Design a protein around this ligand. Structure first.
Ligand SMILES: CCCCCCCCCCCCCCCCCC(=O)OC[C@H](COP(=O)([O-])OCC(O)COP(=O)([O-])OC[C@@H](COC(=O)CCCCCCCCCCCCCCCCC)OC(=O)CCCCCCCCCCCCCCCCC)OC(=O)CCCCCCCCCCCCCCCCC
Ligand code: BCL
Ligand code: BCL
Ligand SMILES: COC(C)(C)C/C=C/C(C)=C/C=C/C(C)=C/C=C/C(C)=C/C=C/C=C(C)/C=C/C=C(\C)CC/C=C(/C)CCC=C(C)C
Ligand SMILES: COC(C)(C)C/C=C/C(C)=C/C=C/C(C)=C/C=C/C(C)=C/C=C/C=C(C)/C=C/C=C(\C)CC/C=C(\C)CCC=C(C)C
Ligand SMILES: COC(C)(C)C/C=C/C(C)=C/C=C/C(C)=C/C=C/C(C)=C/C=C/C=C(C)/C=C/C=C(\C)CC/C=C(\C)CCC=C(C)C
Ligand SMILES: COC(C)(C)C/C=C/C(C)=C/C=C/C(C)=C/C=C/C(C)=C/C=C/C=C(C)/C=C/C=C(\C)CC/C=C(\C)CCC=C(C)C
Ligand SMILES: COC(C)(C)C/C=C/C(C)=C/C=C/C(C)=C/C=C/C(C)=C/C=C/C=C(C)/C=C/C=C(\C)CC/C=C(\C)CCC=C(C)C
Ligand SMILES: COC(C)(C)C/C=C/C(C)=C/C=C/C(C)=C/C=C/C(C)=C\C=C\C=C(C)\C=C\C=C(/C)CC/C=C(\C)CCC=C(C)C
Ligand SMILES: COC(C)(C)C\C=C/C(C)=C/C=C/C(C)=C/C=C/C(C)=C/C=C/C=C(C)/C=C/C=C(\C)CC/C=C(\C)CCC=C(C)C
Ligand SMILES: COC(C)(C)C\C=C/C(C)=C/C=C/C(C)=C/C=C/C(C)=C/C=C\C=C(C)\C=C/C=C(\C)CC/C=C(\C)CCC=C(C)C
Ligand SMILES: COC(C)(C)C\C=C/C(C)=C/C=C\C(C)=C\C=C\C(C)=C\C=C\C=C(C)\C=C\C=C(/C)CC/C=C(\C)CCC=C(C)C
Lengths: 44, 53, 254, 60, 44, 43, 43, 53, 53, 43, 53, 43, 36, 48, 39
């Protein structure tokens, strides 16, 4: 129904799925790197 | 949580993505500099001392 | 009154600086409200009225009583905005979202959009105190003679595509100000057309108009009178000419 | 006739490389101009009396 | 992860490629100048 | 959706070539990073 | 009445979603302030 | 408490969203910097001290 | 006291909402700051004193 | 009468919701002032 | 004394309420600060002393 | 008469609601002043 | 058979990445036990 | 998936596998040779 | 070889039923020798 952008729930779910894929990839990389930096030099 | 996808019924991908890139790169540079500011956590000088160089 | 704190460290100096902060706040209010007399209420791209009408409220109407019996102008008002409102706009939304452009559907120099936009000023000319027209051709302006500079009259008019289109004929002048606003062209096509002096660079051998190319010099809006020119025609002409710095650039050479 | 690449992928690849290298050339031009600016400044400073490099500090 | 090609439906690729060229060259000079500053990591 | 005028096929092609170049870049860069760890380590 | 063009139902849905997001934010924040109070109390 | 959703019959979600996003980011940055300037909560200096570096 | 719902027949909800939000936030900040600037109400200094850190 | 063109019913409604929000605010503030008073009084 | 509702026929109640609100907040802040200045009415210092904190 | 164009009926109702709020303010203020004279008098 | 090639590419890369996950876990584990 | 068309799936899978196995063996031998990282050496001493 | 998608699942499941047995025996052995000699 409401769309200030034109996208209907369908295109929205599609775009969201891909965006979240990218986000979880980014986050995986960052988690790996944080674990590493903890091993090498902890900060807590 | 089931319906977070409606965010793109509010915002446009183009401006959102410009924002995201800018903000993330800014944040990364900021934190890297934060670290390089400490005589510790400065990987460069740390390695310099560790290897006695 | 040295070392005299009313309370704490607060003396006349502190009181004065704080009073100034307060006066300044009121003053920013005043000015950013008086800058609202034109343009508000805020619109969407749909032409509607939007929820965000600013955090500063539009002020109370004042009145301008015009010279020469041209009437009363009230700002802010609906008549003011609706007169200067353009309609039949050749534009197409680039996206359903807001904050994105709107493309010109056709020829923009003609359709009056973008840098080539004009505003419906009133088809009555600009007047001096005496009520005589402000812009007269130098031939009706009794006593007007070139007191210096390069007299352009009779010089060819080179355009943005480096091609030539005509010869200057007459100079339109601001008599009360004693300066040249528009210059007229005797075009090859047998037509007369004005062009603002601020957009024409007088060389020794010619007049250069790097704004527009030659195809455009013919479709320039005309004047219903050859001795006067109204504010409307001025805006149309000036917009048309200035739009060539964007819409005739594929043609501009050198 | 020459310059004709039959393949679609190779045509796309040489185009994108051209675009990227164009941008990098712009950036290099800018960096080089900045460099010439600052370095010419320093050098012209070497032409100045010795009292230029002696001046007291404002501490700031 | 496989529907990332949809970014070229969002951004013109010509300009994106020019921009990446700029960004990467500038990042390179940034780090080289960072490293050059340090005597341990300077090579000249 | 297609804001830029491209279809799924054109976009697939362009992405293929882009990521080709990307993996080339990362290959060269990891090589050079290795050599530098050889020269002046930093961890 | 609606200063933005919404109806009560569009609003209610938007609000359920906003509430979901807000509660997620608050949840992570609570987790974190807890971990902190366990690691270096400020009270 | 049962008609808060009516706020969106008042404010536009685009603006509200951008505003609160900026607000939260700056708030977080300021709190983090505050701690970072108080050396008893500077996680970096602490971890240096706790781990003897 | 019973008719106070007419301040909505005199004012506009949008401006009042934003204004009073700004007001509450800046007030909260000023107050937290007044505390922090006093060693007997700085929860942070007090904490590092109480926990012997 | 209305300087903004609202009717008594929409206004009664707005005021209801505004008062509810205000009272929630005050309730949480009171929780906090009480906690603070128990932990470190000022009066 | 009873005719004082006629000042609403000279003044816009909107202007007046905004101006009264501002005046009131600023007066209050000013006074509370004139108090925080005097060591005898700084209720915070008073509490510190009373409670031996 | 009406510079702001309000008839007496509306002005009178507005002053009613106004005075109600005013006296509420003065009441809260008086209570606080009482408390504060009792806690630290100033006269 | 382009379709068949991507199908098995997925399997190959899938299992190989599971081995990579195993290897990283193992490296984290060694680093905990002994640093380098 | 261009590589699968270029070489029998078996050719690149068998080559890569042997290479990786050899690499693992070499790394392990390098760690065992060193007194430190000799998994056998650290454990016996620690228990004893 | 082609075989069948079913046949491939068939023996691959039998291959797992052997791999698992192998792993179980092996880990029992590893535990037992961890008991006797730790490393
Ligand atoms: C629409 C807006 C329009 C705005 C403009 C309107 C203008 C019209 C007028 C409005 C009324 C304004 C008020 C005027 C009267 C008062 C002015 C004043 O400051 O008098 C001095 C008087 C104090 O006299 P004093 O003798 O220096 O202090 C004696 C005290 O007993 C104890 O003090 P002390 O002797 O201990 O020394 C000071 C001490 C302690 O200082 C303090 O007591 C407070 C310091 C922190 C104040 C933080 C203020 C934050 C406000 C801004 C944040 C929100 C943003 C809002 C603005 C947004 C736009 C930018 O300093 C420290 O930091 C100690 C740190 C710990 C050391 C260990 O004011 C104060 O009480 C302190 C400042 C109060 C906050 C000012 C807020 C602004
Ligand atoms: C103690 C400090 C550690 C360290 C700690 C960490 C940790 C911990 C992390 C980082 C992270 C990063 N580190 Mg490190 N890192 C260190 C040393 C370095 C040094 C250096 C020279 O010293 C560098 C250059 C880097 C580099 C990096 C970045 C590569 C990376 C953050 C990415 C980012 O900002 O994403 C934001 C950027 C953007 C969103 C915009 C990028 C612009 C692109 C190029 C343009 C868009 C292209 C277009 C859209 C194409 C579309 C196709 C797409 C491919 C789908 N690190 C030291 C040794 N590093 C973080 C990371 O990798 O997070 C994932 C991370 O978690
Ligand atoms: C000091 C260490 C412990 C010990 C630790 C372990 C551990 C731990 C394990 C082994 C395992 C095995 N041990 Mg034991 N084992 C010890 C003592 C012995 C002795 C001996 C001579 O003393 C023997 C004969 C064996 C032999 C064996 C095999 C039965 C088996 C490995 C077979 C394999 O890899 O499959 C070879 C492959 C084939 C089947 C090829 C067949 C081809 C056909 C015939 C055609 N062990 C010592 C005492 N042993 C592993 C096991 O249980 O097997 C999985 C295992 O996990
Ligand atoms: C250096 O010297 C120092 C500073 C020490 C001392 C200096 C002292 C000096 C200079 C003192 C000067 C004092 C003066 C000049 C005082 C003057 C005071 C006056 C003129 C006071 C008047 C007050 C009037 C008031 C408060 C009236 C209020 C009225 C109302 C609330 C009713 C509203 C009115 C109307 C008409 C509403 C009805 C409207 C309609 C349309 C019927
Ligand atoms: C000063 O204080 C310090 C810094 C010390 C401490 C404080 C730090 C703070 C406050 C840090 C805050 C960090 C935050 C808030 C991080 C947030 C990160 C997020 C939200 C990351 C999101 C990443 C998302 C990514 C990378 C997504 C990428 C997506 C793609 C590349 C593919 C998407 C493809 C699309 C959309 C195609 C489909 C499109 C169409 C049109 C069909
Ligand atoms: C001196 O001062 C210091 C700092 C020391 C102390 C004081 C600190 C102060 C004053 C702090 C104040 C903090 C405040 C006021 C924090 C407030 C935080 C809030 C309200 C956070 C809210 C977060 C909400 C989130 C993240 C919501 C996310 C929602 C979504 C992701 C979904 C968006 C909506 C969708 C998709 C629905 C669209 C549906 C349709 C039909 C269009
Ligand atoms: C030196 O000075 C110091 C600071 C030391 C001492 C002095 C301090 C002072 C002067 C403090 C003054 C404080 C004051 C005056 C505080 C006033 C606070 C108020 C009035 C707070 C009000 C809060 C209201 C809130 C949070 C309302 C929330 C409402 C909602 C969430 C409901 C949402 C409304 C909707 C949806 C409207 C319905 C709309 C339709 C169309 C049906
Ligand atoms: C040296 O300086 C110090 C500070 C030490 C000494 C102080 C000096 C001075 C000069 C102090 C001055 C103090 C004064 C003049 C204080 C005045 C206070 C007043 C006049 C307070 C008035 C408060 C009024 C209030 C809160 C009114 C509220 C009204 C409403 C909420 C309702 C209004 C009507 C509404 C919403 C409905 C409208 C009706 C219809 C039918 C549409
Ligand atoms: C304070 O911060 C400092 C600087 C100290 C440290 C932090 C640094 C940061 C935050 C760095 C961040 C770097 C980032 C985010 C880099 C990202 C780079 C990316 C995504 C690069 C992508 C490159 C893609 C390329 C080069 C693709 C090119 C493709 C073509 C040209 C197509 C043609 C194909 C060919 C030639 C292949 C044929 C075989
Ligand atoms: C390894 O195991 C241990 C930890 C035991 C080893 C022991 C000690 C050592 C060596 C510790 C390691 C320290 C190191 C090296 C730590 C750091 C590792 C890092 C930073 C790894 C990260 C690599 C991350 C990269 C290369 C970043 C990738 C991210 C991007 C390129 C972001 C690009 C984002 C895009 C293109 C999305 C844009 C989206 C939109 C919508 C514009
Ligand atoms: C020092 O350590 C270094 C670094 C040198 C190396 C360390 C660790 C290494 C190299 C670890 C290696 C792990 C591996 C290779 C794990 C897996 C091993 C396997 C799969 C071994 C070999 C064979 C296992 C079999 C055959 C197990 C069970 C199979 C069956 C029961 C299938 C029999 C099939 C039948 C009867 C099919 C009949 C029916 C139909 C329809 C055809
Ligand atoms: C200190 O504590 C005391 C001594 C007092 C307490 C008592 C006992 C303790 C601590 C004992 C400690 C350790 C012991 C007893 C360890 C024993 C380890 C053993 C027995 C390990 C391994 C045995 C492995 C066997 C029997 C493996 C057999 C493998 C096969 C038969 C091959 C099977 C697979 C086939 C045939 C398929 C191959 C298929 C293809 C396609 C190649």
């Amino acid at each position: 129904d409401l769309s200030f952008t034109g996208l209907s729930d369908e295109q929205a779910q599609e775009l969201h799925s891909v965006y979240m894929s990218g986000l979880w990839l980014f986050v995986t990389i960052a988690v790996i790197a944080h674990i590493a930096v903890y091993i090498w030099r902890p900060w807590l | 949580m089931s319906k977070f996808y409606k965010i793109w019924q509010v915002f446009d991908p183009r401006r959102v993505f410009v924002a995201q890139g800018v903000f993330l790169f800014l944040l990364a540079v900021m934190i890297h500099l934060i670290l390089l500011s400490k005589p510790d956590y400065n990987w460069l000088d740390v390695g310099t001392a560790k290897y006695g160089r | 009154m040295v070392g005299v704190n009313f309370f704490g460290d607060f003396d006349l100096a502190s009181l004065a600086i704080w009073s100034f902060w307060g006066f300044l706040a009121f003053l920013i209010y005043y000015l950013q409200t008086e800058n609202m007399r034109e343009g508000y209420p805020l619109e969407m791209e749909d032409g509607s009225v939007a929820p965000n009408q600013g955090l500063f409220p539009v002020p109370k109407p004042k009145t301008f009583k015009l010279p020469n019996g041209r009437g009363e102008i009230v700002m802010p008002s609906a008549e003011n905005e609706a007169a200067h409102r353009r309609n039949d706009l050749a534009l197409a939304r680039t996206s359903v979202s807001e904050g994105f452009p709107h493309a010109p559907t056709g020829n923009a120099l003609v359709d009056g959009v973008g840098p080539a936009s004009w505003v419906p000023r009133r088809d009555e000319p600009e007047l001096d105190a005496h009520g005589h027209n402000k812009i007269m051709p130098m031939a009706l302006a009794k006593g007007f003679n070139v007191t210096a500079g390069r007299d352009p009259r009779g010089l060819p008019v080179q355009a943005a595509d480096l091609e030539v289109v005509g010869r200057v004929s007459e100079l339109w002048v601001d008599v009360p100000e004693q300066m040249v606003r528009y210059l007229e062209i005797d075009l090859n096509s047998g037509k007369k057309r004005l062009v603002p002096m601020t957009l024409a660079k007088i060389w020794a051998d010619r007049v250069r108009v790097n704004a527009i190319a030659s195809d455009s010099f013919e479709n320039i809006p005309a004047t219903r009178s050859a001795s006067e020119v109204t504010k409307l025609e001025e805006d149309k002409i000036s917009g048309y000419v200035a739009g060539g710095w964007l819409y005739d650039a594929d043609k501009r050479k050198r | 006739n020459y310059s004709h690449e039959p393949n679609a992928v190779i045509n796309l690849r040489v185009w994108a490389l051209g675009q990227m290298v164009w941008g990098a050339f712009l950036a290099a031009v800018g960096v080089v101009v900045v460099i010439c600016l600052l370095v010419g400044t320093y050098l012209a400073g070497l032409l100045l009396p010795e009292q230029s490099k002696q001046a007291p500090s404002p501490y700031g």
